[PDB]
Amino acid sequence: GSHSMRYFYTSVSRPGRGEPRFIAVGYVDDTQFVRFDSDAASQRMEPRAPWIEQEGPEYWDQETRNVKAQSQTDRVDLGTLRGYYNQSEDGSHTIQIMYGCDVGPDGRFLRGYRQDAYDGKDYIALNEDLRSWTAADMAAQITKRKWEAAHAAEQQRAYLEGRCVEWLRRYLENGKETLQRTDPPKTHMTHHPISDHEATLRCWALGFYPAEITLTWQRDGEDQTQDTELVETRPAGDGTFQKWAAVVVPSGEEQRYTCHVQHEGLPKPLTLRWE
Amino acid sequence: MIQRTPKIQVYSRHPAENGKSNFLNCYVSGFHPSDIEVDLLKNGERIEKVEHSDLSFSKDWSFYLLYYTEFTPTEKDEYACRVNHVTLSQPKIVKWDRDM
Amino acid sequence: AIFQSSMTK
């Protein structure tokens, strides 16, 4: 169904420790396909997925060229914001930039966005309409007035609705075997006595893709969202994902509690329960 | 100057099985600033060869990283993740509970 | 691929 391409830029000043570190990473939905590391030896946008490697030399010359320029801009930006906030050249600060486009089943532009942050906090974001900006504070306001006069939103827009989707469609096609598949979650359940009086039921879900998924526990057809442990969805590392949800129940009710798996990768929701 | 502690999760890629090669994982996320020391441990000691994923972040701006190294389980061996962050009074040690 | 017109702040 829906698809997206997102890029993430992180710059961290390092007073005394030399010039700032600039790291970049490209994601097509839940798959990273490229990266750039101002510290590495290559100094080239590098591939991080099989399907993207097939792009030719001029693609990589272009990405490295455009990424270098992007890091130079964030390097000056780093010293500029230090001033806007009257900080010393002693601490290390960070600038984060994330932007991308979303397309629906027919690969037609759906949503587009761009947001920048300073020291983990919002700085300036492009509005939903892709025509104006939203500044977080007075320092960000300086940048806003300028970007509005320099027509920055228009360049961002022409890209989000244009090349951004153009490349997402080409990526979704050149790497179908990875990007368009849907790996359903291989379920399973475990029980661990806590005591002769209580025990823990853990609902597993490994090797699934995309990451989107929902594990929920129920009391005879009643969901219990406040006595159940649930961890953050995590990367197995092979490209797939995993997750589990737990619950603590009396020594006699392990047939009153059902766990439901839901993932676009499986025709019908699962209703696991111990035995 | 926003400071956020990292959530740590220690687990294997594939279901644990003695003798059968696998990968040890340490998934740290939700922290800020970016700096972070992470080591994977084999019986209190530190596993030399450990690769990590490229620095990225979620929408709330917090960073997340994945560390991993090849390993083959054994009924006897104790594996764990050691994370250090400016947000920690000291190193946080999470031991790998396979079954779980 | 990536955007090539980011302006200084």
Does A209 count as an annotated binding residue? Answer: no
Alpha-carbon distance values, A158 to A28, A112, A166, A171, A208 (Å): 20, 11, 12, 19, 35
- Give the resolution value in Å: 2.4
Residue A130 dihedral angles phi and psi, to the nearest 5°: 65, 35
Q: Do B99 and A32 touch (CB under 8 A)?
A: no
* Nearest chain A alpha carbon to B10: A234
Distance of alpha carbon A1 from the chain centroid:
17
Q: Do A141 and A153 belong together in one domain?
A: yes
Range of the domain at A55: 1-181
Residues A62 and A150 in one domain: yes
Per the listing, tokens 């995590």 go with A234
Could you give the CA distance from residue A189 to residue A186 in angstroms, rounded to a whole number? 11
Cα A171 versus chain centre, distance:
17
CATH number at residue A141: 3.30.500.10
**A144 shares its domain with A198:** no
A vs C: CB pairs below 8 A: 49
Question: Does A2 share its domain with A62?
Answer: yes
Q: Tell me the C-alpha distance between C1 and A189, whole Å.
A: 42
Chain B touched by A211 (CB under 8 Å): no
Chains B and C touch (3+ CB pairs under 8 A): no
| Closest residue by Cα to residue A216 from A154, A261, A166 | A261
CB contact under 8 A, A73 and C5: no
Q: Please state the domain extents for chain B.
A: 1-100
Method: X-ray
Rounded Cα distance between B75 and B59, Å, is 40
Structure tokens at A264: 């676009």
Closest in C2, C8, C9 to A67, CB measured: C2
- A133 in C contact zone (CB under 8 Å): no
Q: Token pair of A212, please?
A: 């989107």
Residues A258 and A151 reside in one and the same domain: no
CA nearest B9: which of B99, B95, B70?
A: B95
C5:A159 CB<8 A:
yes
Q: What is the rounded distance in angstroms from the CA atom of residue A166 to the CA atom of residue A168?
A: 6
Please identify, among A163, A181, A199, the residue that sits at the C-terminal boundary of a domain: A181
A29: Cα within 13 Å, side-chain hemisphere:
23
Ligand-binding annotation for A258, yes or no, is no
Q: How far is A8 from chain B (nearest CA, A)?
A: 7
Based on the domain organization, do A13 and A88 belong to the same domain?
yes
Chain A nearest CA to B43, separation (Å): 23
Entry field: residues in chain C: 9
Q: Are residues A18 and A137 in the same domain?
A: yes
Whether residue A192 sits in one domain with residue A173: no
Q: DSSP labels for A187-224? A: EEEEEEEEETTEEEEEEEEESBBSS--EEEEEESS-B-
- The answer to whether the CB atoms of A244 and B100 lie below 8 A apart is yes
Check whether residue A214 and residue A132 sit in a common domain: no
CATH code for the structural domain at B1-100: 2.60.40.10
Rounded Cα distance between A273 and A170, Å, is: 43
The CA distances from residue A57 to A60, A164, A168, in Å, are 5, 20, 19
Give the C-alpha separation, B20 to A261, whole Å: 28
Q: Which of A46, A77, A141 to mutate to test the interface with C (most CBs of C within 10 A)?
A: A77
Whether the CB-CB separation of A246 and B97 falls below 8 Å is answered with: no
* Whether residue A190 is found in the same domain as residue A109: no
- DSSP 8-state class, residue A158: H
A88, with CB counted inside 10 A (0-12, 13-18, 19+), is exposed
Domain end among A181, A196, A217: A181
Residue A122, C-beta contacts closer than 8 angstroms, at least 6 positions apart: A115, A136, B61
Q: How many domains does chain A have?
A: 2
* Residues A104, A174 within the same domain: yes
Question: Nearest chain B Cα to A87, which residue?
Answer: B1
Q: Which residues of B touch A12 (CB under 8 A)?
A: 33-34
Instruction: Compute the count of residue pairs across chains A and B with CB atoms less than 8 Å apart.
Output: 71
